Amino acid sequence: GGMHFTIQREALLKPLQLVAGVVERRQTLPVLSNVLLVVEGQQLSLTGTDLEVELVGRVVLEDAAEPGEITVPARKLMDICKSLPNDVLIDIRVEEQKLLVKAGRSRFTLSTLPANDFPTVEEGPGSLNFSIAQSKLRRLIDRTSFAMAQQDVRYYLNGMLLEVNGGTLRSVATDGHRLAMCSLDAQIPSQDRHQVIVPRKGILELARLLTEQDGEVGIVLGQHHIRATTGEFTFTSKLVDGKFPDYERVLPRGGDKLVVGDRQQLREAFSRTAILSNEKYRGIRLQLSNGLLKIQANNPEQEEAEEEVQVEYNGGNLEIGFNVSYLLDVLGVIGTEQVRFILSDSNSSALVHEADNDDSAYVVMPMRL
């Protein structure tokens, strides 16, 4: 007897597509290009890794299933699985050192590597673990993930901070020019204080998994790894070695200039006038007067774009310059229809909030004019 199970296409494709996603294309060592299939009892367990992240998905098997474990090329399996007609039943078994995929009038033969070639995750015990709604953890990542740095160096900037303090879980992300942070409360005890820095590629992956809009995920924070367990999936990620800076000392303190405006009209006007801004720096000029915002941009060809937007503003007069992409990025994640800007002077950072709550906060440094 050998490994043999039977599964609907849609039953298999849902986790296989996710698991295959973390599997890098054409790795040095061949096993790292494969998904690990394990049948134990009536359950199928697909595991993929890139030596930084390990994703595991599980499917119940409705029919009989003789058990076993083997690894098979992830992409080819997924490509095959998706190319099959809707609702058809797939037969998967091992013969010799090959995987035999039959479904309808189609027969596929993939080349396998042994289950013991697959690396095991050397994960120890948690230092703190809790549960939180998938929607809440997804909100923390998505409301701030845009502000992470984009280089690959193993430095705190190229990752998101997850911080547990009081009864609240907080995400923080910054690239040195802008910062995004979001904070919600959860069923964590209050004597708890602990930080982890999840790398950029990993935390963006974790957000992609938190799709059950009404589900719950179990988080475990350790010295070197972080575990997300959703009953359908088990996501594991190495951490960033190093301490995250005192992000609190980056939030601006003395803003006497409140600007309330329409989120969309600002995004559209910033984006519009940027067409004639400088391609490298993408700087625009904000010119605040009483109840008015005058936007200006110009480029080396001495082309120029102005646009006036009516806004709520009863403060002083201020002229300030910003990298328009930083502004559009913040406006991209603002959920409310109105947006609040808190400025001080032309050379100090801007603070952006949503209209009706301060759970998420965004700091954007300006440009010298």
Partner: peptide, 10 residues
């Protein structure tokens, strides 16, 4: 192009 007051970093 000034940065946020990160220490170190800027």
């Amino acid at each position: 192009v000034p940065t946020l007051p990160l220490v170190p970093x800027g």
